Amino acid sequence: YKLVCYYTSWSQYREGDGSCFPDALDRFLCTHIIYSFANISNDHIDTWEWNDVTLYGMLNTLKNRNPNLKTLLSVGGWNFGSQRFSKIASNTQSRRTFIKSVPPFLRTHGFDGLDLAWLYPGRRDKQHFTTLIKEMKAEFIKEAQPGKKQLLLSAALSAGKVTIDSSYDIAKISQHLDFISIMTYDFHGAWRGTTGHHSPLFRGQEDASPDRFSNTDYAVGYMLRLGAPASKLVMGIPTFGRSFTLASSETGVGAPISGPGIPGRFTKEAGTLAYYEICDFLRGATVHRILGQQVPYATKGNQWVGYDDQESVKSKVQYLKDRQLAGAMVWALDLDDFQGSFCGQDLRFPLTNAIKDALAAT
Amino acid sequence: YKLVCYYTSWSQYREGDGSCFPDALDRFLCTHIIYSFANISNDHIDTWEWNDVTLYGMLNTLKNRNPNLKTLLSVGGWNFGSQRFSKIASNTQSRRTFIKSVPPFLRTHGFDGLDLAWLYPGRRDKQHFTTLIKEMKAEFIKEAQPGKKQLLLSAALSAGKVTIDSSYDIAKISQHLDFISIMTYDFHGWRGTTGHHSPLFRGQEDASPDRFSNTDYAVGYMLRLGAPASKLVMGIPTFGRSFTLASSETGVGAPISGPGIPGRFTKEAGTLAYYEICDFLRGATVHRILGQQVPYATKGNQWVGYDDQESVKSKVQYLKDRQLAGAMVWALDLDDFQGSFCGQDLRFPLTNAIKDALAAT
Numbered sequence: 136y137k138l139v140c141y142y143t144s145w146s147q148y149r150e151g152d153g154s155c156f157p158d159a160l161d162r163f164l165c166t167h168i169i170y171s172f173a174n175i176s177n178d179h180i181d182t183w184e185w186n187d188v189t190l191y192g193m194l195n196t197l198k199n200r201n202p203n204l205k206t207l208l209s210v211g212g213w214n215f216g217s218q219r220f221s222k223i224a225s226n227t228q229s230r231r232t233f234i235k236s237v238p239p240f241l242r243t244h245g246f247d248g249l250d251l252a253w254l255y256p257g258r259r260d261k262q263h264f265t266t267l268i269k270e271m272k273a274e275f276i277k278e279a280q281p282g283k284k285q286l287l288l289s290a291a292l293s294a295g296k297v298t299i300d301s302s303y304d305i306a307k308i309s310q311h312l313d314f315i316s317i318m319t320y321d322f323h324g325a326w327r328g329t330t331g332h333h334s335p336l337f338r339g340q341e342d343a344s345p346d347r348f349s350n351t352d353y354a355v356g357y358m359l360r361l362g363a364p365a366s367k368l369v370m371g372i373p374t375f376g377r378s379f380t381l382a383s384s385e386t387g388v389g390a391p392i393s394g395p396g397i398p399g400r401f402t403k404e405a406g407t408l409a410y411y412e413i414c415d416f417l418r419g420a421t422v423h424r425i426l427g428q429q430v431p432y433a434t435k436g437n438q439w440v441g442y443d444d445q446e447s448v449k450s451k452v453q454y455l456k457d458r459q460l461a462g463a464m465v466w467a468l469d470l471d472d473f474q475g476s477f478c479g480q481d482l483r484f485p486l487t488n489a490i491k492d493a494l495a496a497t
Numbered sequence: 498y499k500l501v502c503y504y505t506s507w508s509q510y511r512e513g514d515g516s517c518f519p520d521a522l523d524r525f526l527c528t529h530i531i532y533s534f535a536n537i538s539n540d541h542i543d544t545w546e547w548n549d550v551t552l553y554g555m556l557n558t559l560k561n562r563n564p565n566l567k568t569l570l571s572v573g574g575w576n577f578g579s580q581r582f583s584k585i586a587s588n589t590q591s592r593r594t595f596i597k598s599v600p601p602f603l604r605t606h607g608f609d610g611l612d613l614a615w616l617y618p619g620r621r622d623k624q625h626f627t628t629l630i631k632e633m634k635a636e637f638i639k640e641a642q643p644g645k646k647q648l649l650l651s652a653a654l655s656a657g658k659v660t661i662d663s664s665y666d667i668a669k670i671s672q673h674l675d676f677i678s679i680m681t682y683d684f685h686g687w688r689g690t691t692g693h694h695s696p697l698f699r700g701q702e703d704a705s706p707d708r709f710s711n712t713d714y715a716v717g718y719m720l721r722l723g724a725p726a727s728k729l730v731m732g733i734p735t736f737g738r739s740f741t742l743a744s745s746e747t748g749v750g751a752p753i754s755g756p757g758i759p760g761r762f763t764k765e766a767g768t769l770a771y772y773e774i775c776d777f778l779r780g781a782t783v784h785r786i787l788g789q790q791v792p793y794a795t796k797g798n799q800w801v802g803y804d805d806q807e808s809v810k811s812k813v814q815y816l817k818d819r820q821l822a823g824a825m826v827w828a829l830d831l832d833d834f835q836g837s838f839c840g841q842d843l844r845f846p847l848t849n850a851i852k853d854a855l856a857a858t
C-alpha cells in the first residue's frame with residue numbers, strides 16, 4: 136500500500152514547537168513524501184522559498200537509511216497564481232520549455248518525480264491539462280531511456296463534484312499519471328451558516344445536508360466511475376480540522392454559526408486547526424462521533440471543530456482497503472503532532488502512524 | 498378552475514410599450530388578480546409604491562363590470578427583508594399588530610383577500626410561518642362573522658424541495674389557506690450549463706442534475722406532504738430564463754459563461770418577458786425538449802428557456818389530470834399585454850391560452 140505524505144515549506148516558519156523542518160520527519164513512516172510547493176518562474180520550474188535548495192537536501196538525505204522511500208516535488212498550490220498556471224499551460228512553447236526543464240531540476244535536487252497541484256484548472260483549461268500530463272509523462276520516458284530509473288508523475292485532484300466535472304478528463308489522464316490523489320477534505324456540505332464536517336467518510340443522515348456529494352465516499356466512487364483505476368487512486372485524509380464559532384447555543388451538526396473558528400496559536404488561520412492544536416483544544420472539550428459520517432467533532436464554549444482522530448483514520452483506511460485503492464494521502468505531515476508533545480503518549484505523528492498501522496494491518 | 502394572475506406595480510415604470518398599469522388588464526381573463534407587492538411598516542401592512550392607492554383603485558375598478566372577479570394584495574416579495582418578515586412573524590406583538598391591521602387595510606382599499614409572499618421563511622422560521630397563517634386565518638374569520646363575505650387567505654410557496662422541507666409545514670398550513678400557489682418556475686436544474694427553469698417533467702434521466710427540479714416533482718411532493726389538490730394552484734411563467742452560450746453547443750446542458758443578455762424593457766440579465774421572447778424569436782430556432790414538454794429558443798450566443806401556447810396547454814392538461822384548483826401566472830405584465838409583439842394583435846396570448854385550456858373538456 137502507498138502512503139503519500141505532503142510536507143509544506145512554509146511550515147518551517149511557525150513559532151516555537153510549530154516550526155517543522157524536513158529533518159523532523161520519520162523516513163520510514165511514509166512511502167512517498169511530497170515537497171510543496173515549487174514555483175513557476177516564467178515557464179521554468181523554479182524554487183519558492185529562499186532555503187528550498189537546502190530543505191530539498193534536508194528531505195532527501197532521509198533516503199540514505201531508507202531506499203524504498205520516494206520523494207516528489209509539488210508544483211502549484213492555492214496561493215499561487217491560477218492564471219499564472221493557465222497562461223503557461225495554453226501556449227505550446229511554454230509547455231515545451233517547462234516540460235523540458237522539469238527533469239533537470241528533479242535530478243539536480245534529487246527528487247524521484249513531480250506532483251501537479253493546479254488548484255484549479257477551469258473549463259477553459261480542462262483539455263490543455265490533459266495534453267499537459269500526456270506530454271509531461273512522455274519526456275520522462277525519454278529522460279529514462281538510457282537505462283535510468285524513470286521519474287514519477289502525480290496529480291492532486293479536487294474531490295468536489297462540480298470541479299471534477301468542469302476540469303478533469305479522468306479517463307484519459309488516468310493512463311498517463313502514475314497515481315492520483317483525491318483531496319477528500321475541505322468539503323462544504325453544511326447548511327449555509329451552520330456547522331458541518333469538512334471530511335466525512337459517508338453522507339450520513341439524509342435530511343441534514345443539501346447534497347450527497349460533499350463526502351469522501353461519493354468522491355471516491357465518482358472518481359472510479361469516470362475511469363480512474365483504483366490501482367492509481369490515493370485517498371486524502373486530513374491531519375487538520377475545520378472550525379466555526381457557534382452563533383446560538385446549539386452544538387450539533389447543523390447548529391448556527393457566526394463565522395469561522397478562532398485561529399490556532401501556531402497555524403494562525405481562522406477556521407482551521409492543526410491536529411496538535413486540536414489535541415490542545417480537546418482538553419476540556421466534548422467529542423462527538425457523528426453517527427453516519429464516521430468522524431468526530433469537538434465542541435467547547437463557542438468553538439466547534441470537525442477533524443479526524445486515530446479511530447476515524449482507521450475507518451477511512453478500512454474504506455480504502457475495501458475499495459482496493461492504491462493507498463492513503465496525508466495533508467500534511469507538519470500538521471500532525473510531529474513532535475509528539477501535544478497529544479500525550481510522547482508519541483510522534485499519531486495520526487499518520489495510525490494510518491500506516493491500519494494500512495499494514497490485517 | 499381558478500386562474501390566479503399576478504400584477505407587479507413596478508411594471509408601471511418600464512419604458513414605452515413595456516409600461517403596464519392595472520387598467521391594461523383584461524377584466525375577464527383571470528378568476529383572481531393579485532397585486533404585488535405590499536410592505537410591512539411599523540408592523541402594519543402598508544403601501545409600497547407612491548401611487549399604490551391609485552393603482553389599487555385602477556385594479557379594483559375591473560370588478561364593476563365583472564362581479565365574479567376577486568382581487569388579493571400580496572405582501573412580501575424578494576426585495577423585502579426576510580430578516581424583517583421573520584422579526585414580524587416571531588415577535589408576538591408585531592405579529593398581532595400586523596394581523597389586526599390587515600383586514601381594515603384590505604377593506605379600505607377594496608381587496609378581497611391577502612396573499613402571503615414570504616420569500617422565504619428560514620429553518621428557524623418554519624413554525625412561526627404556521628402560526629402566522631393560523632392566526633391570520635382566525636382574524637379574517639372574526640372580521641367576517643357578522644354575515645360578511647370572508648376575506649381570502651393565500652400563500653405563494655416555493656417549488657424547491659430543500660426550501661419546502663426547511664420552510665413549510667404543508668399539512669398544517671394548507672388547513673388554513675384558501676389556496677396555495679406553488680411557484681413551479683425558476684428551477685435550478687448542472688452548473689455552467691443551459692437548462693429549462695420551468696420543465697413539466699424530469700425528462701431525459703442522465704441529463705438531469707436531480708429528480709426534484711421540475712414541475713411534476715414539486716406538485717407531487719406537495720400533494721404527498723398533505724396539501725389538498727382542490728387547494729393547489731400550479732405556477733406557470735410568462736417569462737423565460739436566459740443564458741449566454743460558451744460554444745456552438747445549443748442543446749440542454751450546453752456550457753455557458755453566464756446569464757443571458759438583458760431584455761430591452763425588463764433590463765435584467767438572465768430573464769426575459771414573454772413578449773421580449775417573441776421579439777427574440779424573430780430569426781431564432783425553437784426546440785421542444787422531448788422529455789420536458791417545454792420549448793427553448795436559441796440564436797447566436799443566446800439561449801432562453803420559456804413557455805409558449807403549446808407548453809402551457811400541456812401544463813394545464815397536467816394540472817387538470819391531477820385535479821388541481823387551477824393555474825397561477827407570473828406575471829400579467831410579462832405576457833404580451835399590448836398584443837403587439839406576438840401573434841396577430843392578440844392580447845395576453847399566454848394567459849388566454851391558459852384560460853382556454855382550462856375551459857376545454
Ligand SMILES: *[C@@H]1O[C@H](CO)[C@@H](O[C@@H]2O[C@H](CO)[C@@H](O)[C@H](O)[C@H]2NC(C)=O)[C@H](O)[C@H]1NC(C)=O
Nearest residue numbers: 173174175176177178181182183184185216219
Ligand atoms: C514565483 O514566480 C513568479 C513568476 O516569475 C514570480 O512572480 C513575479 O513576482 C515579482 C515580484 O512580486 C513581480 O515583479 C513579477 O512581475 C512577477 N512575475 C510574474 C510573471 O507574475 C514570484 O515572485 C515567484 N515567487 C517566489 C516565491 O519565488
Ligand SMILES: *[C@@H]1O[C@H](CO)[C@@H](O[C@@H]2O[C@H](CO)[C@@H](O)[C@H](O)[C@H]2NC(C)=O)[C@H](O)[C@H]1NC(C)=O
Nearest residue numbers: 535536537538539540543544545546547578581
Ligand atoms: C417598508 O417599510 C419599512 C419598515 O418601516 C421601511 O424601512 C425603513 O425605511 C426608512 C426610509 O429610508 C429608513 O429610514 C428606515 O431605516 C427603514 N426601517 C427599517 C426597519 O428598515 C421601508 O422603507 C418601507 N419601504 C417602502 C417601499 O415603503
Ligand SMILES: Clc1ccc(C[C@H]2CCCN2C2CCN(c3ccccn3)CC2)cc1
Nearest residue numbers: 213252291318321375402404407408409466
Ligand atoms: Cl491549520 C491549517 C490546515 C490546512 C490549511 C489549508 C487547507 C484548508 C484551506 C485549504 N487547504 C487545503 C489543504 C490541502 N490542499 C491540497 C492538498 C494536496 C495537494 C494540493 N493541495 C489545498 C487546500 C490551513 C491551515
Ligand SMILES: Clc1ccc(C[C@H]2CCCN2C2CCN(c3ccccn3)CC2)cc1
Nearest residue numbers: 614653680683736763765768769770827831
Ligand atoms: Cl423579465 C423578468 C421575469 C421574472 C423576473 C423575476 C423572477 C426571476 C427571478 C425571480 N423571479 C421570480 C418570479 C416569481 N416569484 C414569485 C411568484 C409568485 C409569488 C411570489 N413571488 C418570485 C421569483 C424578473 C424579470
Ligand SMILES: [Cl-]
Nearest residue numbers: 658708709718
Ligand atoms: Cl423524496
